[PDB]
């Protein structure tokens, strides 16, 4: 066929084209399919065709972007904005709705427009990857340190508008995000915060501003493209220690979890965001699967007891880092070692103490934790051939046994379905992501097929247990918010109300995060 | 004359007050001369009447609240929703548009609905004072302990709802809110974040929930009545220490700012929320102005030296507080101490250490930075007969220029207006609240004139040197949103798209923060 978007003719969508050239340059119009394809979710879910662009349209400058939210209007064009369009896991770069034009933001517009030492921050534009600017900040010795993914390749802008987190004590990227300014979905632009004061020096400062707070309006959201924004960076500080603790059983996972909460509640002796990885995580971050189980179906016991051996590696696996003088250091190493070691078994490794292949995960998170941005983790699509990963992220209270819970609920799906059960624990003050990565041959339909039916079976069964995931892929996203449905679907009613409002002609990401424009509510797609 | 709602008959407004007594009880619903002059603004500004309440209804439930937002969709009856109403400095409780009721959520809905050891949060109705919530803490042996601002006596919903601060490390209350309850404006009731998941454990513990993030477009807002609301609180510390830097010179505030910032921007060793205040802030605390000057105008250099060397405090004196172990709170103060007394004249001095007159500020705060509500300062409200203040808060970047232009820019029109210049500039990370405390006699027409003109001339000078508020009085919400006007008042014309798709009769608290509904823009009021 030709990809288009509803309602569309060939002919209005050639029109609509050739404006978007007239805005753009030629250069910048990408139309074709054998342009299209590196465009397409690189981990593709499901055996159908699914989440299609039209079109990929890069603009230089604000300016650029509110002419193309105009034509778009105009034609009834649906666009889907992203910055460098990393979100691998979730979706890729693909729209959720087929046929909508990608605006890659971050292929121009990808400029660090100021970094502030004094006061500690950054005022980015879209395309600014976290390499970008740990570049920067080793170019210019800066004092300052930057909070970055597991992949350094996203975008410092695009993870905090999907609401990503890093490692480091200002790992909550959004919580640290000051100021951004927006294009609203008919062509209108906006500043948050103390940049709607003109003349003001302090957009970057003072998040909040006067009156409402709307800046997070515009994450894992479909009101605007968003063309600056502002994001706090701290202080390096003068020393740091990262530390492995390995944990034999599965069943350790209680215990470890209930003994870090009042460790890491009050930020101290745990000062980062710790890990809690489990022995198929690490492993696929070293290693193919077939080094371990060449057979059928799920992994037998005596092939997980061969990784843990021959990486000297546990089933769950912490990881954190400390940062201070070396006095404060050893404290708090101190304090680490003495509650986890009530745990029969635990061992404790620094990263100067491990140099084999079960540290090479030690040595990536003592970089991520520091601000160094790796690619490293990619290793872990090597687990099985042209390997790819859906994200299955719910939400735990840190408590050991609803932990278990999940582990539990997920790891017996995925044997169902013929999946490993990867996991990475995500530690907030108060709250746990609990990270599920299925990885997956991504060449094999039948493969894609389970894992878009194995994982709407978890969205449902988590939900009727009373977890909600915090982020989710395309195909998702309709499952995903139908679970937050207190009230009679009271909160997507809010959003349907305010989308319309701003989007009277529903043109911006129709459908992210399950949230439709009147145009488009009540049809499949 | 009765006090009536804009377009509202005489009849129509009596059937809508009997409305409401079906809904909370004949007692719960205020309307005589008498009984609303208590609800009328106690520092009232300017000389002529404004802020009038119509009514007062007092609910009971959630349902209640919804049936009032119904009732009052049905008669365009305009609702001033409040928690206690103590907003003293900003109208009270008097809503922003005369003839408007006031809804008192706080008179009873008053019930602290869950506080959780482990986890550290409570879920709260809006009349829930800092005193009562103290109270709860200390009847169960919490190890918990709250946040709370200057004055104990208000709700701790309330303030938060305003983006009030308080000065333990959990000073931003905002940011520690965690999950809300809402009466939207048509009287739909909505829950935020995890509380949207039916049968979520995590209302209080993930604020984000899944989708855009809504909770900032509630405070300092007019999209709904708020019922319930979480916020986390944190684990009281071994031990803290509070302590006091008099400085002798107006001008060294460039220092004192510049010397700070080093200490605070990475929250150690300044923990918590350094407080600095000039000599007739902490002299109005303990005296009033007649014990240094009787006659004519603005303070003679004479007194105010009086007043340091007969309290034994600076022009500027500066107030922290540490937490934790005794090694870690003398190595912070050692390092305050190095720091500061870099500067000439600068004094130090523990909450141990001044049993004094003058020292009865430092005891104070010694109360509040641990979590320990007081009315204590309330007594700088004698300053002057029928003392009454307002806050004019512009914000400053944490730069000891910025502050000396500020602190000169207000000094100046305070002489000219002939009022004494109170200041407390409230530190954060990377800005600074800079409080500007006007206290005058409420009772004198003239005087309440002069502090309307003058704050008026006050944001539109500061604006025009890039500075904002924070927050305002009542009085002067539309010349502080109409100084955000960035791009033809880009942020104001968003507010109002989704103020009339929430409330399309226009009927929640019209003209809070400057935002008012289609049906009365264009008129005065
Ligand atoms: C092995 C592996 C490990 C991972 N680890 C992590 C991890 O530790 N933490 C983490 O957070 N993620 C992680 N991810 C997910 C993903 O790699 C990152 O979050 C990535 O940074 C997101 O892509 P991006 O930065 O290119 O954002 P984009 O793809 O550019 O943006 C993401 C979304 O945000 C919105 N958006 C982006 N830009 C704009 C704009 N200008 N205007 C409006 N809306 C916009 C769109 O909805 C878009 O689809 C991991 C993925 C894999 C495969
Ligand atoms: C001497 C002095 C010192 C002060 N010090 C401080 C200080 O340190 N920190 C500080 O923050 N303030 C301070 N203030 C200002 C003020 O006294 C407090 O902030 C006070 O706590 C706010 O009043 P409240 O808690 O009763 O809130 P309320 O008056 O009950 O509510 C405040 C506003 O929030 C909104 N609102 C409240 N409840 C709801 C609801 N249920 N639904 C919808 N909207 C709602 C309304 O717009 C309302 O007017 C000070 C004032 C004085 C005079
Ligand atoms: C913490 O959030 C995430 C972490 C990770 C971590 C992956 C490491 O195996 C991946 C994600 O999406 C695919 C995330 O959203
Ligand atoms: C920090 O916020 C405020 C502090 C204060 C502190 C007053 C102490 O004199 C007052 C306010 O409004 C009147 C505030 O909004
Ligand atoms: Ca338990
Ligand atoms: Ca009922
Ligand atoms: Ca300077």
New interface residues.
């Given amino acids: 066929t030709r990809t288009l978007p509803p309602g569309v003719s060939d002919e209005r969508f050639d029109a609509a084209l050739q404006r978007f050239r007239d805005v753009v340059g030629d250069k910048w119009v990408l139309s074709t399919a054998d342009e299209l394809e590196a465009f397409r979710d690189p981990y593709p879910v499901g055996a159908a065709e699914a989440n299609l662009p039209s079109a990929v349209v890069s603009p230089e400058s604000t300016e650029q972007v509110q002419d193309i939210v105009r034509i778009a209007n105009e034609y009834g064009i649906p666009l889907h904005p992203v910055s460098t369009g990393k979100n691998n896991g979730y979706g890729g770069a693909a729209p959720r709705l087929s046929g909508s034009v990608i605006v890659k933001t971050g292929e121009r517009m990808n400029r660090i427009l100021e970094v502030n030492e ?4 950054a005022l980015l534009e879209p395309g600014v990857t976290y390499f970008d600017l740990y570049e920067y900040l080793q170019s210019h010795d800066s004092g300052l340190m930057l909070d970055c993914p597991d992949l350094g390749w996203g975008s410092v802008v695009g993870n905090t508008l999907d ?1 990503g987190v890093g490692y480091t004590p200002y790992g909550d990227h ?2 640290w995000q000051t100021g951004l300014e927006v294009v ?1 979905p008919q062509g ?5 915060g ?9 957009w ?3 998040p ?14 479909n ?1 605007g493209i968003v063309t600056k924004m502002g994001i ?1 960076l ?2 390096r500080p003068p020393a740091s220690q990262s530390f492995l603790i390995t944990f034999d059983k599965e069943e350790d996972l209680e215990q470890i979890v209930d003994i870090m ?1 009042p460790l890491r ?2 930020m101290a002796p745990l000062q980062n965001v710790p890990v809690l990885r489990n022995i198929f995580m690490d492993a696929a971050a070293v290693s193919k699967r077939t080094e371990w189980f060449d057979g059928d179906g799920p992994m037998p016991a005596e092939a997980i007891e061969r990784m843990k051996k021959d990486l000297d590696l546990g089933f769950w696996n912490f990881y954190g880092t400390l940062y201070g003088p070396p006095p404060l250091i050893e404290m708090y190493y101190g304090m680490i070692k003495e509650a986890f070691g009530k745990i029969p078994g635990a061992r404790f490794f620094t990263h100067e103490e491990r140099d084999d292949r079960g540290g090479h995960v030690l040595q990536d998170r003592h970089k991520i934790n520091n601000g160094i941005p790796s690619l490293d983790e990619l290793q872990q699509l090597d687990w099985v051939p042209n390997g790819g990963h859906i994200g299955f992220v719910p ?1 735990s ?2 408590d050991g046994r ?1 932990a278990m819970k999940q582990f539990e609920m997920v790891r017996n799906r995925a044997n169902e379905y013929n999946k490993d059960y990867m996991a990475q624990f995500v530690i ?4 746990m992501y609990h990270v599920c990565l299925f990885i997956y041959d991504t060449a094999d339909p039948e493969a894609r097929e389970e894992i878009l039916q194995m994982t709407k079976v978890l969205v449902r069964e988590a ?1 009727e ?8 892929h395309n195909a998702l996203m309709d499952d ?2 139908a ?5 009679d679907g ?2 997507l ?3 349907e ?2 989308k ?3 989007d009277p002609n529903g043109i911006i990401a129709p459908g992210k ?3 439709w424009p009147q145009r488009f509510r009540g049809q499949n797609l």
Avoid at 188 to 192: A, P, S, W
Avoid at 209 to 219: L, R
Avoid at 428 to 431: A, T
Avoid at 465 to 472: I, K, L, M, Q, S
Wanted: aromatic share 16%; no cysteine.
């Fill in positions: 004094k006061y500690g921050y609401r959004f919580m609203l209108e632009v906006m500043r948050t103390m940049g709607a004061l003109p003349g003001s020096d302090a970057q400062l003072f909040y501003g006067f009156g409402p707070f709307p800046d997070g309006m515009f994450t894992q959201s009101l706090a701290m202080q909460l509640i009050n939400v209270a840190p609803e907030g003050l108060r709250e939900a247990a009373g977890y909600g995931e915090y982020r989710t995903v918010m679970t937050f449905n207190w009230g009271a909160l009613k809010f959003h109300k305010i319309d409002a701003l995060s399950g949230i």
